[PDB]
């Protein structure tokens, strides 16, 4: 299983088996919470971390299962 990283610089699914047993999709808000919503910063992790204030972290363990609404197809 591989995870993508929107919080590094570009975005790419790299295998994260050393430590992170899976992936994680995070969301929150950028410089100014635009009307478009938050962002989509997923990546790798050992377990869906952060879950007390408002951080909406998520998880995903599958062939690049961190695809967010990026290239709106159609």
């Amino acid at each position: 299983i591989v995870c993508h990283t929107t919080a590094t610089s570009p975005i790419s699914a790299v295998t994260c088996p050393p430590g992170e047993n899976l992936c994680y999709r995070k969301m929150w808000c950028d410089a100014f919470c635009s009307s478009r919503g938050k962002v989509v910063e997923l990546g790798c992790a050992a377990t869906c971390p952060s879950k007390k204030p408002y951080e909406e972290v998520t998880c995903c363990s599958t062939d690049k299962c961190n695809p967010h609404p990026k290239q709106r197809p159609g």
């Binding site: 929107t6 975005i11 969301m27 950028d30 635009s34 478009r36 919503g37 938050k38 962002v39 989509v40 910063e41 967010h68 609404p69 990026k70 290239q71 709106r72």
Partner: peptide, 13 residues
């Protein structure tokens, strides 16, 4: 310039 929840082309505006 974000992989927001509705775009993937570093859109400025």
């Amino acid at each position: 310039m974000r992989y927001y929840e509705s775009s993937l082309k570093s859109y400025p505006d």
